[PDB]
Swiss-Prot record, chains A, B:
GO biological process, one term: fatty acid biosynthetic process
Gene3D superfamilies on file: Ribonucleotide Reductase, subunit A (1.10.620.20)
Needed co-factor(s): Fe(2+)
Species for this entry: Ricinus communis
Cell compartment(s), UniProt: Plastid, Chloroplast; Plastid
Descriptive protein name: Stearoyl-[acyl-carrier-protein] 9-desaturase, chloroplastic
Tissue expression remark: Higher levels in developing seeds than in leaf and root tissues.
Length: 338, 338
């Protein structure tokens, strides 16, 4: 009963130590440009806002009506909603990821650096996503919570190597990509839930989507200023991640039964138009456009090669009855098209 | 609306860098002595095991009977159960804590070192504690989930400085203490729930308690071998933590209303005999006895002073109608004795 493993050797500290100083000296900047784009707790939504109220006489009918709606949502949609939720639930791994980065990590757990304050407030926001989807899926009665819970324990145990090699350059680029990806994934589950006949579930997914957009804004902004100060180092970091290919956080997914769980869940998301191969390149092309890689002047020979590699990759990727039915343990081994 | 803050200046890397090698060289050892005391996922309990089954025709009556039982559990007990749950839910902070430690941290997020494998599998086990207590409290209808969710977001945002200063010595001692403390806290909520007329809730708390015991075993075992190889360095680390005083993980607790939330929740736990000042010293005295500090030979002058300080502290601490009623937002501002 062995979960899938990372296939490559692991590399640490790709960035030079006499280069941590840039982020140390960028602390004030991040206060004024990253930490001012944070919502105070008091003004934040909470999972209870979108769930049946257990301290209300209305609780029983609210639960009953949620379950009635859930019957009319097909299995393959629940498969994707479940994969999205499991990913959200591996959150502890992702805060660990952000705290492996050399010049921008929380060194105590309560560090008063602008980088540490951001990391903690971002985590705290992400925690509500899992909580809300978890209790929604629980109440629904449509899915196998034990096998989901088992998948999650495997996932946190396995963790994940995003190949950011302790570099804020690689790591902040990696977060920029992932934030956009979930914003899209969640955005698309919200759009579909409207017509599927269920406004309350559309609210849940879209409220999560709006959070990811704020996270995206802040991470791409950090890399924006990284290109301003260090065009040579940042363009090389960009290419590096694309050369290696962006590996998704939940790719070591395992439920104790299927050896290709992520690939199988991804294909269902692909077929339903939740997150596609086309999406992947659309993010690449948006990020190449957002950081204006084509207009970067005075680079190295090593930097100009990197520049050309990232600029030409988005059209290259885009140039790339059939699928069978397969059982999923998340839905008691009922089957969906892959 | 400002949460409480850490009152001291933060210190990093108290341990010498030419001393990371000890833990690097201890990797095989931890495999054979720490990682063999880990339960495989397949054999682990999951929160669904102790909760109403939403895919069963019995779901409605199971939920109804849980809520009927919950009416007969008094408010002050729910206050403590809620504080215990919020602490469990700040989990991401605690994995960050373990990954700030110099020679034993996960540097990628999927590192194949024995230290990183342990950290990930421990986190994965801890994640079920929050999930289970969260859904139990939700279904109960006795508590204010929005204000609890708000307290949690404040908590992760604030994080926590355990003052372990990136040292595995200080950090592993700090975990040894905390594991014992929760094992007791959860153990006592389980004992009481029996007579309170509710076996299912007693099962929940005790199953969590059994996990903490396994965690305790492993952490005290690491410090056991630390005293064997480095009596001088470890006794100094022990005292250091006690001199500073063990600060609890959820001590910056804040709900947007009470400025002394942790102190107020602690007092209710104290009055009910869940976790007391007496407990605190009983852990100290167990740990002084467990690591056999009295029998440590050939220490430094600086080491002999440390030895005497830790050995004499447990009796010293033990030598230390009245309380008012106070509202708690966790229970819709209903009041309990403090
Ligand atoms: Fe999210
Ligand atoms: Fe996000
Ligand atoms: Fe726990
Ligand atoms: Fe524990």
């Amino acid at each position: 009963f062995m979960p899938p493993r990372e296939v490559h050797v692991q590399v640490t500290h790709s960035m030079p130590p006499q280069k941590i100083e840039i982020f140390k000296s960028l602390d004030n900047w991040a206060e004024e440009n990253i930490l001012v784009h944070l919502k105070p707790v008091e003004k934040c939504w909470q999972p209870q806002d979108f769930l049946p109220d257990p301290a209300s006489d209305g609780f029983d009918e609210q639960v009953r009506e949620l379950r009635e709606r859930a019957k009319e949502i097909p299995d393959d949609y629940f498969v994707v909603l479940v994969g999205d939720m499991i990913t959200e639930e591996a959150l502890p791994t992702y805060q660990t990821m952000l705290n492996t980065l050399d010049g921008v990590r929380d060194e105590t757990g309560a560090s008063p650096t602008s980088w540490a304050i951001w990391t903690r407030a971002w985590t705290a926001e992400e925690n509500r996503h899992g909580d809300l989807l978890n209790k929604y899926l629980y109440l629904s009665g449509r899915v196998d919570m034990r096998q989901i819970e088992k998948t999650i324990q495997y996932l946190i145990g396995s963790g994940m190597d995003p190949r950011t090699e302790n570099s804020p350059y690689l790591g902040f680029i990696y977060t920029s990509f992932q934030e956009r990806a979930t914003f899209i994934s969640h955005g698309n589950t919200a759009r579909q839930a409207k017509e599927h006949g269920d406004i309350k579930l559309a609210q849940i997914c879209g409220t999560i989507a709006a959070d990811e957009k704020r996270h995206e804004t802040a991470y791409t902004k950090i890399v924006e200023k990284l290109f301003e100060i260090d065009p040579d180092g940042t363009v090389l970091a960009f290419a590096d991640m694309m050369r290696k290919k962006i590996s998704m956080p939940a790719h070591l997914m395992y439920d104790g039964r299927d050896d290709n769980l992520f690939d199988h869940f991804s294909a269902v998301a692909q077929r339903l138009g939740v997150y596609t191969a086309k999406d992947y390149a659309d993010i690449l092309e948006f990020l190449v456009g957002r950081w204006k890689v084509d207009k970067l002047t005075g680079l190295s020979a090593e930097g100009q090669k990197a520049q050309d590699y990232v600029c030409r990759l988005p059209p290259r990727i885009r140039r790339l009855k059939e699928a069978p039915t397969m059982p999923f343990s998340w839905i008691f081994d009922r089957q969906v098209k892959l």
